[PDB]
Amino acid sequence: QEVPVLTTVERKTVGIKLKVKPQINEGDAVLLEIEQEVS
Amino acid sequence: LGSFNGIAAGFYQGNWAMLLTALSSSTKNDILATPSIVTLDNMQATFNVG
């Protein structure tokens, strides 16, 4: 869901924001600069 | 009286009186925190809970 705080306010999200960046290097290997949160 | 804690003993013999007062109290607290992580060397990783 998404909920607004008073900072007149803005949009705020609460959930599981899982994002990554995959880089395939060798025949078989990968690189993952991942970040996320369960809120 | 709503806040008192402990014991006190009522006595009366004619003109005098006396009230004994005592209590013992103790408190104990512990914590422990073991986080673990992996990353490459040069790039920084960061981590937090709470």
A29 Cα distance to chain centroid: 22
- What's the CA gap between B48 and B44, in Å, rounded? 14
**What DSSP state is assigned to residue B37?**
-
Q: Single out the residue of B47, B44, B43 nearest to residue A37, CA to CA.
A: B47
Task: Compute CA B32 distance to the chain's CA centroid, rounded to the nearest angstrom.
Answer: 17
Query: Hey, which bits of chain B come out as E strands?
Result: 12-13, 16-17
- Please name which of B49, B43, B21 lies closest in space to residue A32, comparing C-alpha atoms: B43
Solved with: cryo-EM
